[PDB]
Design a protein around this ligand. Structure first.
Ligand code: CHL
Ligand code: CHL
Ligand code: CHL
Ligand code: CLA
Ligand code: CLA
Ligand code: CLA
Ligand code: CLA
Ligand code: CLA
Ligand SMILES: CC(/C=C/C=C(C)/C=C/[C@@]12O[C@]1(C)C[C@@H](O)CC2(C)C)=C\C=C\C=C(C)\C=C\C=C(C)\C=C\[C@@]12O[C@]1(C)C[C@@H](O)CC2(C)C
Ligand SMILES: CC(/C=C/C=C(C)/C=C/[C@@]12O[C@]1(C)C[C@@H](O)CC2(C)C)=C\C=C\C=C(C)\C=C\C=C(C)\C=C\[C@@]12O[C@]1(C)C[C@@H](O)CC2(C)C
Lengths: 230, 213, 227
C-alpha cells in the first residue's frame, strides 16, 4: 500500500507506516517490542541530526579551509581556552541539554517549563519533536517535513561513515577523495585496491598514524577494525 | 515427524521436541529424569554461550596475528598480557572468582527457587532478575533490546539459532585445542596450510592423528 | 502419450507434461516437492540461457579472433586494445553492481510473482510476464511470444539443454588438449585415430595458478589429470 525498501515484500507486523520514514525495513525485528521502538525512534533522530550537522561541517571545512584535514582537526586546532578548558564547558553544557531531552523521553511534558523564566513554556508536542522556540519557522506541512528530515538524515549517517573509512584508507578529505575517483574511476574503487581470494588476501594500508603526540601525551589513533578490512 | 540425529530411529520418550535444538540425541539416557534434564539444558546453554565468546575471540585475534597487527596466538595471549601490562596473576584470578562467584551464584539459586533473585534484595532491583524460562533470563538487563519480548514466533526461532551456533562453537573450541596439540600452530595458520595444498596437508598427513599412516 | 527418455519406463506422477521439454526424467526424484520443482525449473532456464550465450560466444569469438584461446581470454593482457590491461578491480565493480540489481529483480519475481513487473523510475511501464521465467514485453520486442508459445518453449529448452552439454565439452577439451572447440575439431579430422580422447584424457594443460595484476588466482582441472 506504501513504498517499501524491497518492493513486493510484506512489511513486518510491528511496522505499519505510522512513523515517518517507515518503509517496512526491519529484518532482525529489533522494533517488535513497543517500548524498544519508542527508544530506538529517539536515537535514530538524534543520530541523524548529529550526522547531518557533522557531514555539512566537514564539507564546509574543506572548502573554506582546504589545508586542514578534518580527521586531524582535533590536534590541529589551537585556541586560548586550552584542551581541558574546552572540555569542561562542553561537558556541563551537554550534560544539562541531554538530561532534559532524556527526561522528556521518559515522562513527556514534565520538562517543557522554562526553569528561570516562568512565563515562557514549550507548547504540547511529541517526543523527539519539540516545538515553540525550537521551531520559529516551518516551511510547510510537518508530515512532509518529517519524512524529508529522516530521509536526508539517514543518507547523512551513511555519508559520515563513508568519510571515516575513506579518510582511513585514502588518507584524504571527502571532496579530495571524490576528485581522485573522477580522475581514475576504474583504478580507485575499493575493488581496485583490495581483494581476498582463497590463499591470498590484500588489504589497503592504514594511512592514519598509529599514535598522535598532542601536548606531551600520546593519543592512540587506530584504524577502525583494520584487521577485518577486505 | 521431526528430524532426528539418526534417521529411522524413533526419538527417546523423554525428548519430545519442546526444547530448542532437540534432535532426540541421548544414546546414554543421561537426561531421562525430568529434573536432571533441566539442569543439563542450562548447562548446555552456558557451555555453548561461553564457547561462542571463546571461538569469536580466538578467531578475531588470529586474524590480527596473520595480518601482522601484532596479536599473539590464543595459546600465548595469557602470558603476553600479564607480562606486558605488569599484572599479578593471582590477584587477577581472585578478582575473577569474586565477580563470577557473585554472578553465577545468583544464577544458581534462581534455578533452585525461580524468581527468588527478583525480590528486591540486590540493590532494590526487582524485575531485571526475575527470569523468563530455564536458561533464558530475559529482562531489560540481559535482553536490553527486548527481542524476547517482541514477536513470539521469531523468539522461538532465535532459540533454535542460539543452541546450534553454540554447539558448533563448542566443537570448534575442541578443534582449536586438538589442532594446536597435533600441529603446534595457530588456528588460521592451519587454515592457510590446508588451502595451499588441501590434498597433502590435513590431519591424515600430520603424522599424529593417524599413527599407522 | 508423450515419448519418454527411455523405452518402457514409467514417468513420475508429478511430471505430467505441463512443462516444456518434459520427458519424465527424474531418477533422483528432486522434483517431488512442488515448490522445489519451480526453483529448479528457473535454474534450468538460467543455465540453459547462459550456456547458449556461452557456446555462441566461444564459437563466434574463435572465428573472428582465432588466436585468443577463449580459455585464456579472461586475462587482462589479452583484452581488446581499448580495454587492454584494464584494472580488473574496477571492471568487476561494474558487473557486481549491475548484476546485483538485475538478479535481485528476477529473484523478487520468483518470491512474489508479478510484484516487480512495473518500472520503478518511470511509472506506467510494465511487462506482461505471462509465466515465471518468461518476462515478455520489452524482453520480447519482436513479439514471437504471440502464437504457439508452448512450441517455442520446447525449442528453447531443448536447444538450451544441448548447449549446456556442448559448453562443458569445450571446457574439458580445452583442459585436456589445450585447444578451442573448432581447433580440436580440426585436429581430430587430420588424425582421427592418433588424436582422440583415448590419448589426451591423461593430461591437464591448465597451470596451477596465474598472476592477475599481482593477485594469485588458483586454477584446477575437473579431474586429477597429469599436470
Ligand atoms: C561464466 C563465468 C565465467 C567462467 C565460466 C569463467 C571461466 C574461466 N575464467 Mg574467467 N570466467 C567467468 C567469468 C569471469 N572471468 C573473469 C576474469 C578471469 C580472469 C582474470 C581469469 C579467468 C580465468 C578463468 C578460468 C578459471 C579456471 C578456474 O578453475 O577458475 C575457478 C577458480 C576459482 C578459485 C573460483 C571457483 C569458484 C567460483 C567459480 C567462484 C565463486 C566466488 C564467490 C562468488 C565468492 C563469494 C564470497 C563470499 C564470502 C560472499 C576459466 C577459463 C583464468 C584463466 O584464464 O586461466 C587460464 C584467469 O586468469 N577469468 C571475470 C572478470 C571480468 C569474470 C566475470 O564474470
Ligand atoms: C563526536 C566526537 C568526536 C569524534 C568522533 C572525534 C574523532 C576524532 N578525533 Mg576528536 N573526536 C571527537 C570529539 C573530540 N575530539 C577532540 C580532541 C581530539 C584530539 C586532541 C585528537 C582527536 C583526534 C580524533 C581522531 C582519532 C581519535 C581516536 O582514534 O581516538 C581513539 C580513542 C580515544 C583517544 C578515546 C575515546 C573516548 C571515547 C570514545 C568516549 C569517552 C567518553 C567520556 C569518558 C565521557 C565524558 C566526556 C564528555 C564530553 C561526554 C578522530 C577523527 C585525534 C586526531 O586528530 O587523530 C588524527 C587527536 O589527536 N580529537 C575534542 C576536544 C576535547 C573533542 C570534543 O568533543
Ligand atoms: C553471615 C554471613 C554471610 C555469608 C556467609 C554470606 C554469603 C553470601 N552472600 Mg550474603 N552472606 C552473609 C550475610 C549477608 N548476606 C546478605 C545479603 C546478600 C545478598 C542480597 C546476596 C548475598 C549473596 C551472598 C553470596 C555471595 C557469593 C560470592 O561469590 O560473593 C562474592 C563476594 C563479593 C563480590 C563481595 C566481596 C568482595 C571482597 C571480599 C570485598 C572487597 C571490598 C572492596 C571495597 C572492593 C573495592 C573494589 C573497587 C574499588 C574496584 C554468598 C553465599 C549473593 C548471592 O549469591 O545471592 C544468591 C546475593 O545476591 N548476600 C546480608 C544482608 C541481609 C547479610 C547479612 O548479614
Ligand atoms: C557537529 C558539529 C560540528 C563540530 C563538532 C565541529 C567542529 C569543528 N569545526 Mg566545524 N562546522 C560545522 C559543524 C561542526 N564543526 C558546521 C555545521 C559548519 C557549517 C556552518 C561548520 C563550519 C566550520 C568552519 C568554517 C570551521 C569549522 C572548524 C571546526 C573546528 C574548530 C571549531 C572552533 O574553533 O570553534 C570556535 C567556536 C566559535 C568561534 C563559536 C561557535 C558558536 C556556534 C556557531 C554556536 C552554534 C549553536 C547551535 C545551537 C548549534 C546547533 C547544531 C549542533 C547541535 C550540531 C572543529 C574541529 C574550523 C576548522 O576547520 O578548524 C581547523 C573552521 O574553520 N567548522
Ligand atoms: C587504546 C588502546 C588500544 C589500542 C592501541 C588498540 C589497538 C588495536 N585494536 Mg583494540 N580495543 C581497545 C583498545 C585498543 N586497541 C579497547 C578498549 C577495546 C574495547 C572497546 C578494543 C576493541 C577492539 C576490537 C573489537 C578490535 C580491536 C582491534 C584493534 C587493532 C586494529 C585497530 C582497531 O580496529 O581498533 C578498534 C578499536 C576501537 C573501536 C576502540 C578504541 C578505544 C581507544 C589494533 C591492534 C581490531 C583488530 O584488528 O582486532 C584483531 C578489532 O577487531 N580493538
Ligand atoms: C570469554 C571470552 C574471551 C576471553 C576469556 C578473552 C580473553 C582475552 N582477550 Mg578476547 N575477545 C573475545 C572473547 C574473549 N577474550 C571476543 C568475543 C572478542 C570480540 C570478537 C574479543 C576480542 C579481543 C581483542 C580485540 C583483544 C582481546 C584480548 C584478550 C586478552 C585481554 C583481555 C583484556 O584485557 O580484557 C580487558 C577488557 C575489559 C576490562 C573491558 C571489557 C585476553 C587473553 C586482547 C589481546 O589478546 O591482547 C594481546 C585484545 O587485544 N580479545
Ligand atoms: C555470456 C556471454 C559472453 C561473455 C561473458 C563474453 C566474454 C568475452 N567476449 Mg564474447 N561473445 C559472446 C558472448 C560473451 N562473451 C557472444 C554471444 C558473441 C557473439 C555476438 C561474442 C562475440 C565476441 C567477440 C567477437 C569478441 C568477444 C570478446 C569477449 C571478451 C570481452 C571483450 C570486451 O572487452 O568487450 C567489451 C564490451 C562492452 C564495452 C559492452 C558491449 C555491450 C553490447 C550490448 C555489445 C570476453 C572474453 C572479445 C575477445 O575475445 O577479446 C579478446 C572479442 O573480440 N566476444
Ligand atoms: C575405471 C576406470 C578408470 C580408473 C579408475 C582409472 C584411473 C586412473 N587412470 Mg585411467 N583410463 C581408463 C579407466 C580408468 N582409469 C580408461 C577406460 C582409459 C582409456 C580412455 C584410461 C586412460 C588413462 C590415461 C591415458 C591415463 C590414465 C590415468 C589414470 C590415473 C588418473 C589420472 C588421469 O589423468 O586419469 C585420466 C583418466 C580418465 C579420465 C578415465 C576415466 C574413466 C571413467 C572413470 C570410466 C568410464 C569411461 C567411459 C567408458 C568412457 C571412455 C572413453 C570414451 C571415449 C569411450 C588413475 C590411476 C593417468 C595415468 O596413467 O597417470 C599415471 C593417465 O595418464 N587413464
Ligand atoms: C566439546 C564440548 C562438549 C561435547 C559433548 C558431547 C559431544 C556430549 C555428548 C553426549 O552427551 C550427549 C549430548 C548425550 C549422551 O547421551 C551421549 C554423549 C555422547 C555422552 C564442549 C566444549 C566446550 C568448550 C568451551 C566452554 C570453551 C570455552 C573457551 C573459552 C572461554 C576460551 C577462552 C580463551 O580463548 C580466549 C577467547 C582467548 C585465549 O587467549 C584465552 C582463552 C582463555 C583460552
Ligand atoms: C551456464 C553454463 C555456461 C556458461 C558459460 C559462459 C557464460 C561462458 C562465458 C565465456 O565463455 C565466453 C563466452 C568467452 C570466454 O572468453 C570467457 C567466458 C566467461 C568463459 C553451463 C551450464 C552447464 C550445465 C550442465 C552441464 C548441467 C547438467 C545437468 C545435468 C545433466 C543434470 C541431470 C540430473 O539432474 C537431472 C536433470 C534430474 C535428476 O533426477 C538426475 C540428474 C542426472 C542428477
Amino acid at each position: 500500500s506504501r513504498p517499501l525498501w524491497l518492493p513486493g515484500s510484506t512489511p513486518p507486523a510491528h511496522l505499519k507506516g505510522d512513523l515517518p520514514g517507515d518503509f517496512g525495513f526491519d529484518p532482525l525485528g529489533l522494533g517488535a517490542n513497543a517500548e524498544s521502538l519508542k527508544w530506538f525512534k529517539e536515537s535514530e533522530l538524534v543520530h541523524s541530526r548529529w550526522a547531518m550537522a557533522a557531514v555539512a561541517g566537514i564539507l564546509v571545512q574543506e572548502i573554506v579551509r582546504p589545508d586542514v584535514f578534518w580527521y586531524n582537526a582535533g590536534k590541529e586546532v589551537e585556541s586560548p581556552l586550552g584542551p581541558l578548558g574546552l572540555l569542561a564547558v562542553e561537558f556541563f553544557l551537554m550534560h544539562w541539554v541531554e538530561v532534559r531531552r532524556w527526561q522528556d523521553l521518559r515522562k513527556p511534558g514534565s520538562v517543557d517549563q522554562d526553569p528561570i523564566f516562568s512565563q515562557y513554556k514549550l507548547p504540547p508536542h511529541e517526543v523527539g519533536y519539540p516545538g515553540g522556540v525550537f521551531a520559529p519557522f516551518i516551511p510547510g506541512d510537518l508530515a512532509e517535513l518529517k519524512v524529508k528530515e529522516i530521509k536526508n538524515g539517514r543518507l547523512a549517517m551513511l555519508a559520515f561513515v563513508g568519510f571515516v573509512m575513506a579518510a582511513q584508507v585514502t588518507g584524504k578529505g571527502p571532496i579530495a577523495a571524490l576528485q581522485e575517483h573522477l580522475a581514475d574511476p576504474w583504478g580507485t574503487t575499493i575493488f581496485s585496491k583490495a581483494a581476498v581470494v582463497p590463499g591470498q588476501a590484500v588489504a589497503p594500508p592504514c594511512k592514519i598514524p598509529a599514535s598522535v603526540s598532542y601536548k606531551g601525551i600520546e593519543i592512540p589513533t587506530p584504524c577502525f577494525l583494520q584487521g577485518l578490512w577486505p | 515427524v521431526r528430524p532426528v540425529w539418526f534417521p529411522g530411529n524413533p526419538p527417546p520418550a523423554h525428548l519430545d521436541g519442546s526444547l530448542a535444538g532437540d534432535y532426540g540425541f541421548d544414546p546414554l539416557f543421561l537426561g531421562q529424569e525430568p529434573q536432571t534434564l533441566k539442569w543439563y539444558v542450562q548447562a548446555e546453554l552456558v557451555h555453548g554461550r561461553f564457547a561462542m565468546l571463546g571461538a569469536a575471540g580466538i578467531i578475531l585475534t588470529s586474524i590480527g596475528a596473520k595480518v601482522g597487527l601484532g596479536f599473539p596466538e590464543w595459546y600465548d595471549a595469557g602470558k603476553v598480557v600479564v607480562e606486558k601490562n605488569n599484572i599479578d596473576f593471582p590477584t587477577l584470578m581472585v578478582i575473577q572468582f569474586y565477580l563470577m562467584g557473585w554472578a553465577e551464584t545468583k544464577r544458581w539459586y534462581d534455578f533452585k527457587n525461580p524468581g527468588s533473585q527478583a525480590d528486591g534484595s540486590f540493590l532494590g532491583f526487582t524485575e531485571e532478575f526475575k527470569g523468563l524460562e530455564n536458561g533464558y533470563p530475559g529482562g531489560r538487563f540481559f535482553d536490553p533490546m527486548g527481542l524476547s519480548r517482541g514477536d513470539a514466533a521469531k523468539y522461538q526461532e532465535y532459540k533454535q539459532k542460539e543452541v546450534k551456533n553454540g554447539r558448533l562453537a563448542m566443537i570448534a573450541c575442541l578443534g582449536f585445542a586438538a589442532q594446536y596439540a597435533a600441529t603446534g600452530k595457530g588456528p588460521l595458520d592451519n587454515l592457510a596450510d590446508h588451502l595451499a595444498d588441501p590434498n597433502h596437508v590435513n590431519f591424515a598427513t600430520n603424522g599424529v592423528s593417524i599413527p599407522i599412516a | 502419450d508423450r515419448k519418454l527418455w527411455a523405452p518402457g519406463v514409467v514417468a513420475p506422477e508429478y511430471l505430467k507434461g505441463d512443462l516444456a521439454g518434459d520427458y519424465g526424467w527424474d531418477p533422483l526424484g528432486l522434483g517431488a516437492d512442488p515448490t522445489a520443482l519451480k526453483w529448479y525449473r528457473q535454474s534450468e532456464l538460467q543455465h540453459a540461457r547462459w550456456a547458449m550465450l556461452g557456446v555462441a560466444g566461444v564459437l563466434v569469438q574463435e572465428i573472428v579472433k582465432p588466436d585468443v584461446y577463449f580459455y585464456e581470454a579472461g586475462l587482462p593482457q589479452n583484452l581488446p586494445e581499448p580495454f587492454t590491461n584494464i584494472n580488473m578491480g574496477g571492471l568487476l565493480a561494474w558487473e557486481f553492481i549491475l548484476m546485483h540489481w538485475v538478479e535481485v529483480r528476477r529473484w523478487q519475481d520468483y518470491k512474489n510473482f508479478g510484484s516487480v513487473n512495473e518500472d520503478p523510475i518511470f511509472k506506467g511501464n510494465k511487462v506482461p510476464n505471462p509465466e515465471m521465467g518468461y518476462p515478455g514485453g520489452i524482453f520480447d520486442p519482436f513479439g514471437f511470444s504471440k502464437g504457439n508459445l508452448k512450441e517455442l518453449q520446447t525449442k528453447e529448452i531443448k536447444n538450451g539443454r544441448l548447449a549446456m552439454i556442448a559448453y562443458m565439452a569445450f571446457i574439458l577439451q580445452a583442459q585436456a588438449t589445450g585447444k578451442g572447440p573448432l581447433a580440436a575439431l580440426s585436429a581430430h579430422l587430420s588424425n582421427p585415430f592418433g588424436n582422440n580422447i583415448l590419448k589426451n584424457i591423461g593430461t591437464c594443460t591448465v597451470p596451477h595458478s596465474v598472476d592477475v595484476q599481482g593477485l594469485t588466482i588458483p586454477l584446477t582441472c575437473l579431474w586429477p589429470g597429469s599436470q
